[PDB]
């Protein structure tokens, strides 16, 4: 059910949030706490505040990740996502709130798939 | 007993903290799911004025009837030991009970109540009623996480670190809240609401907040309070034609409101002087 | 007796409160499951009329049949000891009872009534009738949760986290509501409904809600009252060719409605003026 | 029994709601409160109102769950179930409203079973 | 106990380091997203004061509630066994526990605590409350990264060629922070706040930052604290007027602020001191 | 996707930085070092030093580029990107740092095109 181009801000933001959570999780194993839990409600309500800080935090995890191939593939997926969106909205609507969770969950399901992401890198 | 029915508009702003409590299911400030506006339940505002009474008068004829450790059934029962209610009958029991209850309290005399739990006493409707309040412009929550110096208990989490669980403190950067209120004389007869009591109400609102603080609440304060009074026991004009006279607007050249300076208040009294009095209280 | 025949349309909104709640579904507002629109059963609005009269008139020839706490058979029997104690010999003794009742209680003289419980006193259809009233556009109910400081009883003597049971309150962020009302003439001739009663009735409708404020309802109002006046005892034109001339429409710009400024009201008076009349009351 | 992929909207929404309820249950053990009376009435016609709002606060309950295995298992389960949907509908037909209840009860029966979710997770 | 309602405005600045570490994102200064201002959480202030008192007094009736490692339930059970000397009714037992607490720990008399988590001991309220403090002007964050001479652990990271422990020690070139605080006499009576304890509080503020230095923290200094003393038990004026009597203005000449000289403090007390007592305690 | 003239500092400067990154990466096939992450957090914090230094860095990487048509196309496009800007702000607020990252990732995909930049130079 992972659409590639839904273009709804909620869906794409949920995809982005899933990417962020997975990156952070793979970055350091010894951590049960999830940034998703700490930020989910505020993010789905309004993305500007949480997302600015998340952007600032991203490079640290990105570089300190041990393996290079995971880093390049994650950056590539970020590229494949960001071109739909344009600018962080100030506020969300209800259907957007739901579609955000939908996109997040869909992207999580795609990421847990073992090799498909590596493939999509390969056709690039 | 008070005669002229009243209407009033109330404007109070929360500075830097949870203005109303968590919805008890998902702990945040109360928020409109769709518009992005914010609400404070009226009951909270009512309880604030109740506390102010409890700490201000301290006299018989001004008891409060809901206290942190009171148990309602015994309070009802003890009223069944007054002399008037000794020898009466089914209807008469209840009627005398209501008379005595309204006699001794002020909470009951001003806001209604339900007294049918045990030995019944009835209901009252309360001459004074208040609505929900709503935020003028959408509020943008903030969530904060903070740590505890020491473990809560020598529980399974008796480990040295508290970095596993921290707990959070939500907050709101700023806003305003608008509230409406009605005073109806037709009920004053049934309870004995008196002019002195109304004066207490007016003095209570303006100083409700300063005499009440807490950690979670953070600073709050009250800005506006405008009262219209009618000339006769029948409304001269319906409510809305009045309420539109008092309007507040976000300033022209501001994108985000961050203080009372941002908003702008305006008052309409072009014709209002027909048979109505506009008393300005808040400022 | 009224020598004309009236049909009218009524427009009223709700701001932040449960207009009338399912006696079964907890207390949540009455909604249409398939289309998600609101409902306000007629008996509710009629009861508001009766309460208004109770407060305003308080003499004889405007007493009201239904009361807060009373015995109906007592009211019937009391009528059975008027002058016509038995002189009508059970043939029109019941008819005499009808005439006396309709002579006193304005409620029965206006709306229908059934008095056949004990010593049967008759039936009246009622010159005035009202329809259910429903919401123009769907509404979404905002459940809440609130908390009381102290426990009612001692049965839950202990106070724990699960204790202090919350209990709830329901609200509706906005809406709008259409009402359709009919007035008969030939029925009017039976129970002496008079023009003066009609004038009182219009004033009852326009000023109904200000004199009724509870905790739950919150603010309500009256947006419009339009009256189409026949020119014959015979129905001049059918109903729909009347009603369709007053069309209320959601404005385009907004997807979610929040206040009366959003909606748009259109009154059509092409050629009905030739016989029929249209008078504006709401505004 | 329970259809894995009946795919009609009511059934999947009912399964989702049942899972959320069970999460609320184990998250707060010392409790009897049920979201049942809270939101069946909402869920029948306009899920678009209620589902996203609940989803906002699921992560808190999930984190407050003490045991990691239950949390991750239920996480994977809801990831599986949400695959079928693509968009929260705003209105439902009568048969949809009923089938929502049927799905809820089938899902509750399946979850309360002793080890089924364990087996499915272990497959994952 | 207390004598007059008390209010105070508080200022303090940081030359370098991290005033408060946000655990949301790394350890950035807690910053307001939209306006680019930095919130200093109050709980930090309160912890600093507790630490100072723990440092200096070290005597009975002045023990500090939240020590470095103390497990709370041991303290509450210790008190209960101490007042198992009472061993009496639950309400009395809880109240006696409260009293023994308030007698013992300066923290509790000074600020509340939820002791009831274990064997219940109640909810104190605390008569001193402080709000969040926010930077007067937008902050400036300058991330820094540094090098470790040796690897933390004998792992795969023990390669000389690649070093990744760049570290992060954020800081601020300069700023200021403003806070408001309230001392309400009435609540003392439940906890028995005493004049001397208030005096030690006044002392602990103006002399705090000298006893709290850390590597990550860096230099801080308090600039000016002002105390308003109420004339009588009820507030003679609203808090807002009193607070806004004090103003801070960025110097016109400067566009970037790097030192106290770049700011100007304006104090005004021509008339609103007619019954208030302004003490310019510091600065 | 991207915009040539979104006309804000973060978007354009991130575009600038990604341009520089690909220039240096392509000019040296034997360039394992990830200069991108070396200055990314720096620029997101404040550019006033890093970009000035990178400007004097440029001509060496320019000359040591193997193919000269690539180089001339590069200074061409650089001309269009820099024409929009009018000054360097030292301080950088959060939202335009977000737009910085947005512009970076957006224009990276433009960079990855097989022949687009050559075409854009062709109509020049």
């Amino acid at each position: 059910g992972l659409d590639r181009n839904r273009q709804d801000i909620g869906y794409v933001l949920g995809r982005l949030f899933a990417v962020l959570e997975k990156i952070q999780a793979e970055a350091n194993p010894g951590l049960n706490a999830t940034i998703a839990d700490r930020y989910f409600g505020s993010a789905s309500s309004t993305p500007i505040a949480v997302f600015g800080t998340l952007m600032r935090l991203l490079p640290h995890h990105l570089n300190k990740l041990e393996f290079e191939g995971r880093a390049v593939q994650l950056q590539w997926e970020i590229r494949q996502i960001l071109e739909h969106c344009q600018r962080f909205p100030n506020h969300l609507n209800l259907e957007q709130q739901g579609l955000f969770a939908i996109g997040y969950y869909h992207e999580t399901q795609f990421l847990f798939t073992k090799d498909a992401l590596k493939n999509l890198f390969n056709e690039a | 007993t008070i005669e002229k029915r009243y209407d009033f508009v109330f404007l109070f702003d929360v500075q830097d903290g949870n203005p109303n409590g968590d919805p008890d299911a998902g702990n945040l400030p109360r928020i409109d799911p769709q518009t992005g506006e914010g609400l404070v339940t009226d009951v909270c505002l009512k309880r604030k004025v109740r506390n102010f009474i409890q700490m201000t008068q301290n006299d018989e004829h001004h008891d409060i009837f809901i206290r942190e450790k009171g148990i309602l059934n015994n309070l009802i029962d003890e009223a069944h030991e007054q002399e008037n209610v000794k020898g009466k009958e089914k209807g008469e029991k209840t009627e005398a009970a209501r008379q005595y209850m309204c006699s001794r309290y002020y909470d009951i005399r001003t806001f209604g109540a339900v007294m049918t739990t045990g030995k019944n006493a009835g209901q009252v409707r309360g001459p004074v009623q208040l609505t929900f309040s709503r935020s003028i412009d959408p509020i943008m929550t903030l969530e904060h996480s903070i740590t505890r110096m020491a473990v809560t208990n020598e529980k399974d989490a008796s480990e040295t670190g508290d970095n596993r669980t921290m707990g959070r403190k939500f907050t709101v950067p700023y806003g305003l809240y608008r509230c409406h209120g009605f005073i109806s004389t037709h009920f004053a007869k049934q309870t004995g609401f008196s002019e002195n009591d109304l004066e207490l109400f007016w003095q209570a609102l303006v100083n409700m907040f300063d005499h009440d603080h807490s950690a979670a609440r953070g600073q709050m304060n009250a800005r506006g309070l405008y009262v219209f009074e009618h000339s006769n026991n029948l409304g001269d004009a319906p409510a809305d034609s009045l309420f539109k006279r008092i309007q507040v607007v976000k300033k022209d050249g501001v994108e985000v409101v961050r203080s009372f300076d941002d908003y702008l208040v305006s008052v309409d009294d072009k014709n209002l002087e027909e048979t109505k009095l506009l008393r300005k209280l808040g400022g």
Side-chain angles (χ1 to χ4, degrees), chain A:
Chain A
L2 183 62
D3 173 13
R4 275 297 152 175
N5 304 322
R6 193 164 267 225
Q7 305 306 109
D8 314 331
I9 305 298
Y11 206 73
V12 65
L13 286 190
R15 306 185 63 175
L16 183 48
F17 197 80
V19 176
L20 294 174
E21 192 285 346
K22 178 56 69 70
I23 297 169
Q24 183 273 10
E26 293 179 353
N28 61 332
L31 194 51
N32 54 47
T34 64
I35 297 169
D37 173 72
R38 274 161 41 161
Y39 290 168
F40 175 74
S42 182
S44 162
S45 66
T46 286
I48 178 169
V50 65
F51 269 71
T53 63
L54 287 167
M55 295 298 102
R56 284 291 51 61
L57 191 60
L58 175 62
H60 183 306
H61 312 337
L62 180 142
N63 64 92
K64 65 83 171 183
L65 192 45
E66 57 285 344
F67 182 76
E68 51 88 19
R70 295 327 313 139
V72 65
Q73 297 224 349
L74 283 169
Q75 173 84 330
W76 173 78
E77 181 53 284
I78 286 293
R79 294 195 298 120
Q80 315 310 112
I81 298 311
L82 264 289
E83 72 277 26
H84 307 132
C85 64
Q86 278 66 51
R87 174 281 331 280
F88 291 128
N90 63 7
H91 183 27
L92 277 297
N93 206 305
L94 175 70
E95 69 276 16
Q96 276 58 64
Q97 310 204 7
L99 290 200
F100 174 85
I102 300 305
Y104 167 75
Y105 264 50
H106 278 167
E107 277 287 333
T108 57
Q109 186 42 75
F110 160 85
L111 291 164
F112 180 75
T113 71
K114 273 74 177 177
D115 186 74
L117 175 59
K118 271 66 58 187
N119 298 115
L120 271 296
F121 202 108
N122 300 338
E123 290 94 10

Side-chain angles (χ1 to χ4, degrees), chain B residues 4-9 202 225-232 234-237 242-243 245-246 267-269 271-281:
Chain B
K4 301 161 68 176
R5 75 149 65 252
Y6 293 105
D7 291 331
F8 58 83
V9 62
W202 298 133
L225 179 70
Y226 306 78
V227 180
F228 305 131
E229 75 180 4
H230 294 176
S231 88
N232 60 318
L234 276 297
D236 289 310
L242 296 174
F243 285 176
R245 263 55 170 257
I246 288 302
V267 181
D268 291 331
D269 56 346
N271 189 359
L272 276 298
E273 59 274 12
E274 309 88 357
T275 45
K276 277 73 69 178
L277 272 300
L278 189 156
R279 50 173 295 191
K280 299 179 182 180
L281 283 197

Side-chain angles (χ1 to χ4, degrees), chain B residues 92-239:
Chain B
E92 320 309 321
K93 286 300 152 173
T94 73
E95 170 55 38
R98 268 185 60 242
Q99 289 301 324
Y100 166 56
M101 293 293 243
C102 302
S103 72
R104 87 168 300 166
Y105 296 105
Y106 177 94
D107 178 36
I108 304 304
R109 289 222 307 293
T110 307
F111 314 129
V114 172
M115 302 200 236
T116 67
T117 67
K119 286 195 291 294
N120 200 326
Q123 299 84 243
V124 191
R125 205 211 275 288
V128 179
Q129 284 283 36
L130 286 179
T131 176
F132 273 61
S133 173
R134 157 170 319 255
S135 58
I136 300 286
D137 294 335
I139 59 167
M140 278 168 285
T141 318
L142 293 171
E143 162 172 327
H144 289 141
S145 178
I146 62 170
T147 71
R148 185 174 310 194
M149 186 66 204
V151 289
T152 300
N153 169 24
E154 45 263 51
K155 63 176 77 68
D156 57 355
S158 180
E159 184 178 1
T160 312
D162 196 74
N163 202 2
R164 270 80 65 195
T165 58
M166 280 86 87
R168 311 172 299 178
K169 174 188 283 190
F170 302 70
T171 198
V172 174
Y174 187 66
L176 267 162
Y177 285 62
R178 177 168 191 165
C179 182
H180 297 294
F182 312 105
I183 303 308
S184 71
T185 175
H186 286 206
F187 292 103
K189 75 174 79 68
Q190 297 195 336
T191 314
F193 209 69
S194 67
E195 283 289 331
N196 164 74
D197 301 333
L198 187 76
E199 179 60 31
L200 293 175
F201 205 72
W202 298 133
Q203 164 191 97
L205 291 175
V206 191
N207 303 353
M208 188 161 315
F209 284 123
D210 297 341
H211 204 291
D212 165 83
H213 277 306
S214 173
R217 289 287 190 268
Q219 178 180 1
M220 271 165 288
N221 54 4
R223 306 296 175 182
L225 179 70
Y226 306 78
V227 180
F228 305 131
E229 75 180 4
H230 294 176
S231 88
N232 60 318
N233 282 317
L234 276 297
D236 289 310

